[PDB]
Symmetry: D2
Subunit: 448 residues, 4 copies
């Protein structure tokens, strides 16, 4: 039996820049990704989110698709620069009105709106003032949060602050593969600290003006042993500290992992005690974004963790090159439950897989059997976790739609609904068909 607990919430997730398009429309401001994507060499095939899924225009169609999928929740992000073009100061009413209509549409459809404040699209105007390197951003972010907290009070009840601080910082400040495209360990350390402070400040503001539940969203990639060599275990700890514990540990009031002094070396810094008090402001829930695991070994020339993943050729890999290994999802959920004392409600806010699909539907269908297989095995892994006592309250499939996979462009399809980027025609994939049935049966269909 794979029936899920009472009240278990099923949904799907997106992000603003990945689906919306209409980057300049109706007074929308300029974001770091507007700039980054229009700089040559940054994006695969020169792709941008200028059009994407055209969701800003086709959201009503997209809500209809959600209903066909029997979604009970829809997780989305708000574009900071669409609502507050200069990041601070004047509101863009028409921009804010889009989310206003969207949320009401969802509520009328009986779909719970789960909003994320920040999904990587920082206003360019704030980047010009230092972005995540400017400690004032904690205040700017809380103010932005307040606007949505009050505007949507009683409508959006479950809130996420930051989506994946690691990717934001590792990609955007440490290695430069993502906006704003900086490459510096000095900046990475500072950016990481201010992301945490910003989350904390947003939660404090939420206690003052908000209604419902608030939490952060972390991606975790569990690190498994490559050998019995002590050098590899040390490497595994470095990889694990830099990716999985960097943010979780201070969030739990335990300070930064000890290994970061070694990983970041001279770039490492100590911060005032009041910062850590702020960062550890108690939350109501936490989101887990999960896709795969890694098997790190020692890699002396790899900067800065001195580690590299060992290819697990015994298992399938997705088109993004990620190992398919559902037991590690169960392990990670158990681990995170322990890290939170089993007292913090958990929600898989993202999980899914990318495989090749044709650019157009065939016979009005898209057959994606590997995405189908990934979906069912990982949902089963959720059930195993719940059986081991993990307080897990929901699952959001990434993603609702094929979309802009950031720097990898449109070449990587994560959607359970196929998007023809030439015609904007939507087609529900076989994965989406199965998912709609998983929801209807509350897991029962996984028996067969």
């Amino acid at each position: 039996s794979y029936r899920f607990p009472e009240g278990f919430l099923w949904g799907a997730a997106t992000a603003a820049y990945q689906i919306e398009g209409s980057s300049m429309a109706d007074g929308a401001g300029e974001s770091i990704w507007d700039r980054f994507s229009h700089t040559p060499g940054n994006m695969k095939d020169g792709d941008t989110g200028d059009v994407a899924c055209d969701h800003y225009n086709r959201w009503r169609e997209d809500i209809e698709l959600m209903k066909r999928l029997n979604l009970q929740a829809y997780r989305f992000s708000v574009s900071w620069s669409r609502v507050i073009p200069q990041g601070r100061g004047a509101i863009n009413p028409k921009g804010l009105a889009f989310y206003d209509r969207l949320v009401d549409g969802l509520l009328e459809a009986g779909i719970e709106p789960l909003a994320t404040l920040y999904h990587w699209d920082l206003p360019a105007a704030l980047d010009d003032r230092g972005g995540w390197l400017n400690p004032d951003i904690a205040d700017w972010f809380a103010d932005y949060g307040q606007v949505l907290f009050e505007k949507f009070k009683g409508r959006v009840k479950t809130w996420g602050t930051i989506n994946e601080p690691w990717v934001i910082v590792d990609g955007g400040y440490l290695h430069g593969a993502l906006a704003p495209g900086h490459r510096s360990a000095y900046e990475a350390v500072i950016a990481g600290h201010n992301v945490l402070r910003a989350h904390g400040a947003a939660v404090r503001r939420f206690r003052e003006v908000g209604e419902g539940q608030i939490g952060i969203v972390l991606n975790i990639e569990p690190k498994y042993p490559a050998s019995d060599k002590p050098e590899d275990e040390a490497a595994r700890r470095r990889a694990e500290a830099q990716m999985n514990r960097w943010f979780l540990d201070p969030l739990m009031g335990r300070g930064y992992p000890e290994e970061l002094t070694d990983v970041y070396g001279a770039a490492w810094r100590e911060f005032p005690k009041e910062d850590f008090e702020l960062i550890a402001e108690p939350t109501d829930w936490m989101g887990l974004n999960w896709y795969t695991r890694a098997v790190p070994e020692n890699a002396p020339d790899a900067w800065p963790t001195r580690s590299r993943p060992v290819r697990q050729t015994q298992h399938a890999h997705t088109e993004t090159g990620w190992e398919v290994y559902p037991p590690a999802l169960t392990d990670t959920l158990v681990w995170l439950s322990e890290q939170t004392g089993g007292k913090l409600p958990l929600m898989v806010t993202e999980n899914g897989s990318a495989w090749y699909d044709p650019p157009h539907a065939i016979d009005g269908r898209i057959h994606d059997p590997m995405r189908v297989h990934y979906l069912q095995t990982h949902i089963k892994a959720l059930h195993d976790a719940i059986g081991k006592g993990v307080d897990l309250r929901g699952y959001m499939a990434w993603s609702l739609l094929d979309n802009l996979e950031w720097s990898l462009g449109y070449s990587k399809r994560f959607g359970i609904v196929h998007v023809n980027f030439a015609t904007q025609e939507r087609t529900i994939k076989d994965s989406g068909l199965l998912y709609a049935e998983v929801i209807k049966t509350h897991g029962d269909v996984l028996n067969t």
Copy 2:
């Protein structure tokens, strides 16, 4: 819509020695250029080699059993020159010859037509040390090698292929160097191309003297379509077309070399003795077509040596090898090739198929490959269209029978209609293979 095929139409599947056999040093087998090439670092993806491959040398009995499950009427395979004659010239390796002796007898008795190819890219290293395809004497070495097989398998193998894809042998092996023997030279490419043709002609002459049955060459054609109405693009198209599709076909048809090659190869181009062209044009009994895709070339001044590059056709699906999926071009090519041969040369599609990601292991004893399924059914229909237009097409060989070593791309590119678990050597018939077996049994009727 009826897709019933002509009476006597031959259905089979194809492989090549180095891609499936393994046992590279076993039982007195000689060293080939691919034994050397694959064991040189940086040449092969993931450092893959053909040392084990599908272990077909050991498991051929199992594979014949698979052919019977697929209802195959023919099996197209290549003979390893260096397995049969270790030094390329001189002493026979009896136990190596015995493998093909057993294989053919096994096939005949299964009621399967053995279609043998003399050369599928695995030149003996000992001959490479004597210049390989750059030594004009290779025409004679090849004829001698052919004679051994012609006489040994007389009355058993009745349909013979000489050279499989002279273009890939030369473009890859001598012009750009991505394939064995890994040379990069326009000067050598011109010469190697000429001797490949001469070697083919010499083998046909030898066949008339000592052979029994039908003999021909196997060409790959990639039809070149217009990118625009710009004259410089049409000139680009003609260059690309001449270098890839007409380079070998024209002198094989007694029309000398394409005029554009003087422009393409410049100072590397040469004139050859008239007696060479007499040899090259030695009349054949049939011709094989290897076909996968089309291209849409545009002018590209810095592209060496044709000054052309393909325009990505984003409107259509692409395989994992990056090839556009477009079956009408197959119909067009067959008509074109029929015209170029006056409609009097029997044609056979000796290779056609597609590469898509498959997991490294079967899942519940199945491999679901819907895009390979779709490719298969659409291109087989495209054959029927060609036959309806008067093309003398007498057979179809699916590439490939097994997932195998895709040369420099290693095992990462799966062409098989039968899945091979390269960890365990377990075979699993893919959904594409299941459909093909039904296409054969119904002689096309399953397509309607």
Copy 3:
């Protein structure tokens, strides 16, 4: 022909703080962007940093003795912003200011005129974290920094430079990312350039309020010559000329931004408030020119963003930095710059010199410098030619006094007229600085 120079013509040598000082953390000095950039792997050739450099912070007295041996009449240096004001704003570091206090006293006492530059590329990291040159507030930050020096050195430093080479600051640091802070964005480049201009103006205004002497900016100019008669190439030349040579000069002369920048920077280009340009065009008392070579631009469609690239001038010598040796272009540039200023602005060649290979140690107390010696003779002569056509040229600063850290190219590029053995810090006067010392003594007569 006499190559004697007008009375009052000032002879000197030039350096920059980060390139020579070392002692990055010494005596409460702050962290700069070059402290970060240089310690990030892959940014610097051979992993060189400015941690030690010429150890000038410790050896400045010895170096002043060398200036005397060279018969220098002026010494041009830069003040390290973060050494004086560690956080860029607020609390002053007394000891950091004490060093420059002592240095200036030492110069005047030795009879050598101190020419201070406010900004030579080493922005405080604290200010970079607030947006750096992307934050419009930096004009105020810079002015306050300038005031601290203007007052401190009232009556001692009489000739002031504000910004050293805005183009290199922006093109290298924000457009292409080859220099600190290592950003790569046309959007940021436009904004940074504007704020660099604004900061210059605000500095000049503050100077009028609180300072005694003359003040000006220092531009680098690289004259663009025709590569052919082709229209495309002439358009390329304008784009190249506009982006490098006119971008800053034109608004400094109140002529606005060059029209071609709209074409070069496309969607990244922006229009600014008219009040900004009035601040930018604040009257200066002089202008400095950095000159080394010319360029011969041709059309290059894939070269971003000017769509131009230099044609190698094989008929002439090239320095180790790859710059063509062509002294006539210095004469032309000086005339051109005189035209652009209107003859009403005093000019001073504030950097000129060349890099050639020298051994890492002196050979028998000597460094034989024939090509650098030759460069100096031919280029000093070209000044006279300019003075001969009535350009108001009032001085010449040789780059550089010492072999130093050539930024990203590390210590591998030696510009010094004095050799520095980076292994021992031992100084050795090159033949180049030795012809130079003689040129001053004879005031240009030795050149006849």
Copy 4:
């Protein structure tokens, strides 16, 4: 300090055919592998070829005058195989052979001893088409080629060299592919090296039959020094040493192949029949040493195939080809080579010199090359040190007489003691050449 050399000690300068002659197709000359290699895009720096070079084929009389101006007692040159025998075997090219006929007569009449090298890397393309150095027959082709020269210049050329630098021929041409014929294969490298040795032996045997004078091989040696006291590094040093310095010397001394080569080349290594080693160790009359620098190899697991890499010796000067300047290593090498040959073989430094930047044209009728001057004097001194230690050194040939085509590095690397302006073909004696002319004249007394 006394630096007078023994009576009879022979002073000269050296060139190679392809590097200086030009006139690649002139007067019935055949095509070589370097004609092909150099005209393939990507192979040569700046796309440089030897089509013109120093135009020596046309200007050899002017050059002979230069040798007299330099008071050369000897001129070491190579004969172009394909210029004399266009197809490598068969018909002789009269006018091609006539060129070397007149050249030798001009030298003798000028009192300059002609030192001919049979093979300086320019294999006939026609023989490369037969496998080149991978074909065991090449020993006979080379012997036949030698005989043509041995008889033509009987009594006129008395000192003969067979192979110039087997290591560079094989390491560059067959192992790494940086030189013609551009192959990259350890399997081919092992075989090529063996046939080069066999060809050397066969040529010496033929010389005994039909020639007059003294014959020997020319080896390059690059002495390997310890990088540390780590065992991993000493093993790397031994691997590097065996593959570069002992690979050819040891079998030439009847000592067989170094045992480390089974470790360096692994599965590519082969055993050869005992008869071959008799041929290889065919007694010679003298041996040449090409020497320029040393190396300090450390362990490099990823470096193929020796798994070693040189540690940059920053304490010393390096030439423009990146070679450390360290004269004591020259003395050590000569002592080593003397010991290896039992002291009973006469030796001659047959190449030594250095590359530094020179302008493309003379500055007024002079080229001041102080670092090349310094290299020359310090190394000629190191020769004297060697002779003082008992090494039977009989002469010294400066590499090179003229600035020429430095193979793949093009004309960018100047080794000449005489400057060549490749725009005008005008020659100008460098200061190094002026010093050399006096060193000869005082028989070393100037070094005093």
